[PDB]
Amino acid sequence: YAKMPFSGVMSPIKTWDAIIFNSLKGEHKVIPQQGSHVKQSFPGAFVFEPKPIARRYIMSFDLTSLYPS
Amino acid sequence: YKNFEKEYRQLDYKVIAEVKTANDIAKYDDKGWPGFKCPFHIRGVLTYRRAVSGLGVAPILDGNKVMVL
Amino acid sequence: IFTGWNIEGFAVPYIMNRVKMILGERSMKRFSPIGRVKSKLIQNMYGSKEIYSIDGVSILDYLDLYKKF
Amino acid sequence: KMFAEEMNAEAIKKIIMKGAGSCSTKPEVERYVKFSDDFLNELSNYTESVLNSLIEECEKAATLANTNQLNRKILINSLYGALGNIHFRYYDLRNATAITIFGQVGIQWIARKINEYLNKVCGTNDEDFIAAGDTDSV
Amino acid sequence: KRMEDIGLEALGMNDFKLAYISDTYGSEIVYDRKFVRVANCDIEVTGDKFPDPMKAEYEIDAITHYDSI
DNA sequence: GCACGAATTAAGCAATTCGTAATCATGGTCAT
DNA sequence: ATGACCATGATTACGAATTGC
Numbered sequence: 001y002a003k004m005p006f007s008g009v010m011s012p013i014k015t016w017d018a019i020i021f022n023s024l025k026g027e028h029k030v031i032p033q034q035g036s037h038v039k040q041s042f043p044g045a046f047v048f049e050p051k052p053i054a055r056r057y058i059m060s061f062d063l064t065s066l067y068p069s
Numbered sequence: 070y071k072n073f074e075k076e077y078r079q080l081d082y083k084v085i086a087e088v089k090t091a092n093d094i095a096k097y098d099d100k101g102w103p104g105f106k107c108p109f110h111i112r113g114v115l116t117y118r119r120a121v122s123g124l125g126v127a128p129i130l131d132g133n134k135v136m137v138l
Numbered sequence: 139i140f141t142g143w144n145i146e147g148f149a150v151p152y153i154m155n156r157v158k159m160i161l162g163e164r165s166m167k168r169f170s171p172i173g174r175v176k177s178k179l180i181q182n183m184y185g186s187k188e189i190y191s192i193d194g195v196s197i198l199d200y201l202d203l204y205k206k207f
Numbered sequence: 208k209m210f211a212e213e214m215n216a217e218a219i220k221k222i223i224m225k226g227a228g229s230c231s232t233k234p235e236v237e238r239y240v241k242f243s244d245d246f247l248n249e250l251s252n253y254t255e256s257v258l259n260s261l262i263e264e265c266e267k268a269a270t271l272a273n274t275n276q277l278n279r280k281i282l283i284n285s286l287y288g289a290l291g292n293i294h295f296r297y298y299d300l301r302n303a304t305a306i307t308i309f310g311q312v313g314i315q316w317i318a319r320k321i322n323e324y325l326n327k328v329c330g331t332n333d334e335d336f337i338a339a340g341d342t343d344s345v
Numbered sequence: 346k347r348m349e350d351i352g353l354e355a356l357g358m359n360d361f362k363l364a365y366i367s368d369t370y371g372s373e374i375v376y377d378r379k380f381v382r383v384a385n386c387d388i389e390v391t392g393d394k395f396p397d398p399m400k401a402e403y404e405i406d407a408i409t410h411y412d413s414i
Numbered sequence: 415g416c417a418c419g420a421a422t423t424a425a426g427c428a429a430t431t432c433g434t435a436a437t438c439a440t441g442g443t444c445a446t
Numbered sequence: 447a448t449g450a451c452c453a454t455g456a457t458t459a460c461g462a463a464t465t466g467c
Contacts, residue, residue, distance in 0.1 A: 012285040050339035062344035067287035173352035
């Protein structure tokens with residue numbers, strides 16, 4: 001589905017590069033060359049602070065694929 | 070809690086002792102006795118080596134999983 | 139020769155990152171007379187910051203010059 | 208498509224457990240879609256072996272559809288991890304920081320709104336109803 | 346290398362394997378699992394000392410290799 | 415520090431444990 | 447006689463060093 005060599009499937013970075021290039025070439029566009037940036041740490045996953053007590057009646061919810069959304 | 074405190078004691082010593090993978094025994098292997106900041110499992114391994122000293126049975130070496138009591 | 143006090147730590151990087159983030163790399167590379175602005179990433183002492191190298195002008199941080207000479 | 212294939216699996220199992228007949232003909236069966244009602248009616252008399260042939264085809268179609276589903280899910284889930292690796296081709300720190308900070312702000316905002324609405328409905332005040340939340344679930 | 350020395354972006358897919366796949370297949374690929382030869386190997390070597398992956402000292406007594414086609 | 419290449423992210427507490435101190439619970443022999 | 451004080455084991459804290467996702 002991504003039109004790559006097999007082993008690349010063990011590498012997400014390549015998995016997307018290939019699919020994006022396929023879709024982009026599909027309408028005769030051009031992909032920018034790979035540049036260079038810094039290995040930098042940014043804020044990540046955030047977790048609430050629960051008070052260690054007992055919960056009797058409690059409900060729950062979630063976000064369907066939050067980051068792609 | 071009470072009845073399991075009872076049952077655990079009569080259980081076999083080969084089903085209740087903590088399972089831990091033993092490695093780097095050598096650096097704590099001081100005269101066959103536990104070294105400084107010796108983990109529980111390394112301490113147990115060295116106790117085994119002293120106990121099996123003179124018995125001529127299979128000893129323990131770096132990287133061998135053990136069961137500690 | 140393009141100097142200043144603590145220049146590769148706060149001046150050179152900030153100006154070049156801002157021109158990249160505002161004008162694009164095609165104008166960021168206009169600093170050098172030969173059109174080559176390659177970013178080195180390491181500063182391995184704590185791995186904190188990043189140095190820059192504009193091929194054609196000799197960056198010489200006056201803070202380092204004073205610290206060493 | 209996988210929903211379709213599973214409902215055809217149930218239908219063919221029903222056909223095999225009620226009704227049978229000798230039909231040596233093995234006509235081609237449409238794939239990636241649901242069979243027509245008239246067709247499955249005329250192949251209802253497939254004893255078991257001929258029905259089993261249909262059952263195996265339906266099972267392999269369902270398996271391929273499921274594997275495509277997991278393909279899509281893994282790609283979607285790995286996109287974010289791809290867009291934050293400095294060796295990616297479209298890496299841009301502003302993008303990753305934007306999506307992460309937006310996730311944090313959105314989850315905390317939804318928690319705040321939940322607290323407000325629950326306090327309004329219950330009539331109490333300033334009681335933190337949220338028990339524990341990750342970046343997405345709560 | 347020549348254009349990178351100048352400093353202008355060299356657009357296009359740097360890895361030519363993806364270029365080959367994109368150019369010479371193009372349309373959606375249809376494949377069958379009965380033609381891919383996937384193999385499963387397992388080994389068993391009789392030796393006194395613990396097996397060392399780089400030394401390759403002993404002979405090999407048990408080899409098993411499963412083929413799909 | 416020396417081009418050239420796989421990009422699964424280091425670090426935060428999590429949790430452990432031993433050395434030693436401070437401190438406390440208690441006995442041995444004493445001034446009485 | 448009767449504690450009273452010096453000497454002798456538990457007890458908990460803190461510090462220093464080591465992995466784990």
